[PDB]
């Protein structure tokens, strides 16, 4: 274990090496967020004289308690504050020019921070020989409020913050890269969830340009989240009347405490109420409009989804699990509104079990699939080369009841399954690590390559309208072509 | 002189004792209180906490009624009891080193027991095989294995298998957590005896335990033991919650109903066996002999066995077993064998000594414990598992010999605890039991470490197989022994 | 490196181990002498939640750089603070009851800490399998400025404090020792220079009494740096003057930046006006006298010194090296006074070189060896057990103009010879390691069984008033008898 | 290709730069800059920073006079110079490992020179032997060999010998640091030619030097080369003062004269070797030759040795040496062997061939460099150290081939430096040159890595002993003479002149 010593454009960084990997946590891509800068774009840090530490994570953003996962996991309560705004690199040495890899967690724009161990780095970067980096976001109010409105131009792109973080991160690595061993112009991104949603926007925002050139979009993409102007005004003001904020008033506003913000953000009730802004600058379009027209018809895109994505929910919620119809059908109408009746006796028919279980496919394919499938379609016809993948590898955990479920891929595509907590949420089952290497190194192909296509894996056709190729990661991998017709046909039918 | 040895769990720090020998941490918490909300819930990890906690008291036991059939012989002193009973206990030579673990799983029909009786001490086993040994409380009782699922509706999904997610949690803390206190988490053995080696038998079968332990040992106990249908599980559980006084449906009074009044309720269903381990679909998606012979376990390594006496022990509860023939013996045998009984009680007559009662205790031991045995070992001979088999033939001296190798004389010679308090009051006091204690206890070991129970002291230990059934004989002289239930298994196939 | 926790009376800390040894730096023995307890004598520090961070060295107490050893060696500056209190253990394993040896570092009551790495004692607990304590105390005027004339009673004992902090360090000791394997009852205390000045006070002072069983005194004696509290309330105007606060202004007294105690305490110009002060409440009596008195007839101790003590003041002064008499004269004058003259005679005609060179045993005899062998003289006529070496071995760096100077042995007796900056004092000659060997059993042996012998030295007998033997520290170490028998006679008449 | 490397000393981290294969990291400060009131002073570990200190750049030269000699043999322009000069400069694979290191003092009178010269570039012998390279700065001229004991008194003690304290200065900062760069402190090899030689000599006597380092190789040097009584560098030193201006005790115009005009103070004096290293007793508390013959160095493994025409070089400043005058080639000899000048010009007149200057050459080499090497390779002998022998035979054609195998000329072949820049000009281009020059490299390379020069190219070359007097000689055709000054050693016995 030894101290290594990089030199960025605003100072010099002393990280850690084993030897084989090398590691800088902590590192400022941006000046803090706080006073005059809360609620601000993002301004380039200050340069430091010194040499900096980067031995240590940074304070994750201000987030509410969001244990879902965490009680599952033994997972600890992060250490947040609203001076947030750091990554953490991965590479096996400052010396070369690899393919790097940007990652963008999920946790619906309000939770989660690149410093989680599941995100570690560390065997990418030995195993593909590539530079890993994962970033924090503002998350929340500080993030996502769109203050246009109530505070007026001043504010502008206020709804965008949490991605103008994840730009200035990209334009850092774009200017520093280069002094950890990456080349900046191999650059991948991917996320999971919010995650791949911030993937889906900054192929549609303009200033994220340039900036990669590959895509990777687990579980969720630009159809996932995106509010419009409109929407997200009226979702500011509930959370400024929770916050005690008039409009106009600009003290009041810097000077709230961060956590007021984050009680506030909960106090208007469960689901994604912050989120990405159509606001015509940061945003200019949405971003499935931004795919259709082809603006990503030079970015290479990788697109999947688990096969049971929405059986995470029934931890909070049992009744997936049950047959009881009132409140099975008041679940799939708040997602689905009018269609729910007809989609409905489609499901009910397929599958065996419980009327909760056959009904967890139907939301997985509203909120997952269907945005999925459109990133998938939008970027064949213009012509960009795509993959499409499938999750079917199932966790034994809670009597089986999650199968393959929402955010079980992480610990595969990262094989960090050893970290701490991720085999209380994958099981224990030996098959589990021949599995990950199968999706990790497809992963590392894609990044290097453009082509996710490894010795491992079966031949894994480009998706195309025609066949509809998709790659199935099981204990025995299968590509299957059209495994949604069915479906894809009826909610255009319903 | 007795020093702290203070280690750290994910969760916090622990503060355990040592001799200098040996440590011990008792009442380590490995998951959350099931109380309130929480109660007829899945276990979850425990809250993390600074500062240094205290590990040199045991925890209390879950919520149960007195067993005075074990009691009376043993000192039996009433445990201490709570609902926040989720607590266990580790034993080894020191925090550094990465020894091989054994996880012992009580016995005591779902109801009773906990990992603090004295005669489950790991200190002798740590001492003896260099291993780290923990043993581990589950919720019992209807806390632990109600099917509330028809009552309550799927919020109680697995709430007939609740005792047996609190088993997989305390091997997903020690998988996580045992490396601090010196063991090899790669290298887990389960050992269990009686509604334990029930337990252990649902382990092999279900699929979230996968992986969390390489190695397995029964005793006195099968996967076929205590098992209920979902629908033998509802009906059970609407009898529990009449006697409760909670309505179905009535999520109010099940949370605020104490935690003595859902031990009194299932006392008052009357003896036996009510709960057990469900094939619920999820926790336990098959019965766990399907799973076996499906090749559920073909990976795991078994140690599978009975005392030669078994059933004698229960003929302490009832008379009639030691008396004279009766049509209510033959009522007895029949609720276990149904139509079969018949046919068994006569081949059964005319085999042993002593009253018609008495040659009708091995009858009901092959029934419930024989049976599951062989069928557990010939499972795993099938699959290709690694297989050994045993018969404890030790006999104690108490009650003028009745009781012979019955239920329950094993354990304190697998953990050489003969001079727990009151243990020679049940295996007597003659010193050739030393002999036989060791015997077992360094066969036990050495399967925990190398998965292979044979070892100096012993004579040749054949691996069981289909063709000789080969049974390691614990005796005074051990010796092996091949198919010694070939004629009992070929009548009870004969009939049902 | 794996952490190791201990529980404290006030709490627990969290340390590292190699498996072979476990430290734990930074252990607070005395709650922080800042604002009110400014000042004022240590009180046991606040009992804490949780698992208190001891991987990491406390600050050092507020002092001037002195760049003696420090320019020569190149050691970084001490990060310092006034909350200062804290002490560093280094023990085999936490289960045990070994014998403790605690360090009291020196820097004339002025400068150091207990975090410099020469005084690392992993060596010491490896190799002796005992527990090693350093330990900072108050230096400069936070620790002994005399202030009981100035701001009156409310100060009494302020021209001791330091000796107090020492004191609660080793009281901190016996109630808390035994959770990280140490046994309370078997204590030596064990300090260099104005160290081994602070164990000189230490046996006189009547609080110390049952903190500890035996003692080695490196350098110093209580004949070193002891003052009257006459002249220490003078020195103390002079430092209050500097510092522009008025006696009896409270405020303005806790008012002071803590470096502004350090600079006035400079300005004061060179020397040390600074040390512990026979108060008549702490120390009543003069150390030499109590010991005189039988005070210390119970403990057993270890005294020595360097052959060419003096040699290291040569670096900053180069008049030593040179022949010129008039300044070297001066310098003789200002410490022996009117006995000068004759003296510097007896030392010109003996040895040989400059008149400088030989001068230089003229100061280190009147500096070391005399506060030396009147502490040895004293404990032999009561009859408590002691013995006295010489260290020889001479440092070949700048010339071989320091010899075997002062502060030498520190790395020898330590076993930190390869410690960073080390070397540089001590020279590379492959040599050093068997010497420092010697010296340091000797000094795990005196630990352990209150006898220095060990199978690598000669016999060594016990200094008494007929032979006076010393052990001789060097190469091929050997016994003299009355090696200072010239001086004695010539310093006498 | 080329990237940068950050490495931390004790003192703060460093800036270098790598291609790959090497990494080089120059002007690492190893002390305190010795200026103003630490001028005359002994070095100083520096003084701690933070941040990246730049360490892409050479460190300025100690103040020197020119040298002609050198400069129109070579191309290299005048050297950038300072005061501030106390700079080291360090070739390696890689930071991580631990390494043999090869530690260069540079020879040039104790007057010029630097470490920075591009011949003594340590890239070749890092990337063949796989070492770590170090060459250094010590103080040069009147700054760094001026004895002021006298004059101003003991605040000037060891003043005569202040270079050698840096050299002592530099490996106490290798001790210390090179671990960061991918050396092994514990073997360390200290090299050097000519008056680096006769300061490595010294190094082997001085006390404050011991263990420092294992092994040493003195080429066209010794012990013997430049040292100066006491009471011989007092006189110097006054003359020195006198032409700066300064007088005895005025510690005013000893710190504020300019750097430079000591350098032309010195030059005043005239040509020869004025300054070198005083037995002022301390430092160096006897002679070096004497400290050799008591065993000071019986530890320390030597290889030495000299060139076949070492003192030909120096006609190119003195044509009479080309001459046939008796009376001037007389006063020459009389200089350096004094009364014996009269037995040996008739011993080396009838010797060798050409006018009788050019056969009283070797004479003079015999006197300077030969001498002093048997003398070093003899006690080491005696005193049990192990010691190997060598004679570079390499001839330069230039200049007629009056050069022949002169001094410095093994320098490149040693460093593989044949082809940076100018050496052409020196040695010659014919296409044997690289064989000899493998055959010194890896011999180098060896010895500090094993301590034995034995290498595949090289014929079997025996431990140098008083007996066979073995002596590896360097030529296209490698071969091993026994006693090839046999000759000369009796009749310079007899001479009482060695």
């Known amino acids: 274990l030894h101290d290594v010593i990089v030199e960025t454009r605003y100072g010099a960084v002393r990280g850690r090496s084993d030897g084989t990997v090398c ?76 393919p790097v890899m940007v990652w963008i967690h999920g946790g619906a724009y309000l939770t989660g921070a690149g410093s989680i161990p599941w995100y570690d780095g560390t065997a990418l970067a030995r195993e593909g020989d590539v530079v890993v980096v994962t970033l924090n976001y503002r998350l929340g109010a500080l993030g996502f409020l769109y203050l246009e409105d109530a505070f007026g131009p001043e504010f502008t792109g206020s709804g965008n913050l949490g991605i103008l973080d994840q730009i200035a991160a990209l334009r850092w690595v774009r200017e520093n890269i280069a002094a950890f061993g990456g080349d ?144 099975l059908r008041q679940r799939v109408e708040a997602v689905v509104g009018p269609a729910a009746g007809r989609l409905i006796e489609f499901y009910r028919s397929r599958g065996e079990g419980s009327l909760g279980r056959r009904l967890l496919p139907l939301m997985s394919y509203a909120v997952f699939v269907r945005g999925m499938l459109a990133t998938a379609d939008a970027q064949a016809r213009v012509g960009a080369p795509v993959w499409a993948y499938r999750f079917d590898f199932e966790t034994p955990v809670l009597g089986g009841v999650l199968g393959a479920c929402h955010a079980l891929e992480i610990p595969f595509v990262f094989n960090t399954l050893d970290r701490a907590g991720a085999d209380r949420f994958t099981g224990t089952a030996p098959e589990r690590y021949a599995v990950a290497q199968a999706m990790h190194r497809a992963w590392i192909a894609f990044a290097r390559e453009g082509n996710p296509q490894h010795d491992g894996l079966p031949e894994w056709p480009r998706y195309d309208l025609e066949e509809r190729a998709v790659m199935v990661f099981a204990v025995e991998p299968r590509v299957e072509r059209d495994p949604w017709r069915a479906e894809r046909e009826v909610w255009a039918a319903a």
């Open 184 to 327: 900046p112009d191999r650059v991948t991104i991917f996320g999971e969830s919010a995650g791949a949603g911030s993937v889906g926007v900054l192929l549609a925002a303009p200033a994220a340009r340039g900036l990669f050139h590959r895509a990777i979009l687990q579980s969720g993409s630009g159809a996932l989240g995106v509010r419009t102007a409109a929407s997200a005004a009226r979702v500011a003001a509930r959370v400024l009347q929770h916050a005690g904020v008039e409009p106009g008033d600009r003290e009041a506003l810097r000077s709230l405490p961060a956590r007021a913000w984050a009680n506030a953000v909960a106090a208007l009730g469960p689901g994604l109420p912050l989120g990405p802004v159509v606001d015509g600058t940061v945003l200019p379009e949405h971003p499935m409009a931004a795919l259709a027209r082809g603006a990503a018809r030079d970015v290479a895109v990788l697109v999947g989804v688990n096969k049971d994505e929405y059986n995470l929910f029934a931890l909070q919620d049992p009744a997936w699990l049950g047959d009881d119809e009132a409140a």
């Open 23 to 98: 590691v800088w946590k902590g590192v400022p891509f941006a000046r803090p967020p706080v006073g005059p800068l809360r609620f601000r774009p993002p301004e380039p840090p200050e340069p430091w004289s010194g040499v900096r530490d980067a031995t240590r994570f940074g304070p994750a953003s201000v987030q509410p308690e969001d244990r879902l996962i965490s009680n599952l996991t033994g997972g600890a309560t992060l250490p947040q504050d609203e001076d947030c705004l750091y990554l953490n690199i991965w590479s096996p040495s400052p010396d070369g020019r690899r």
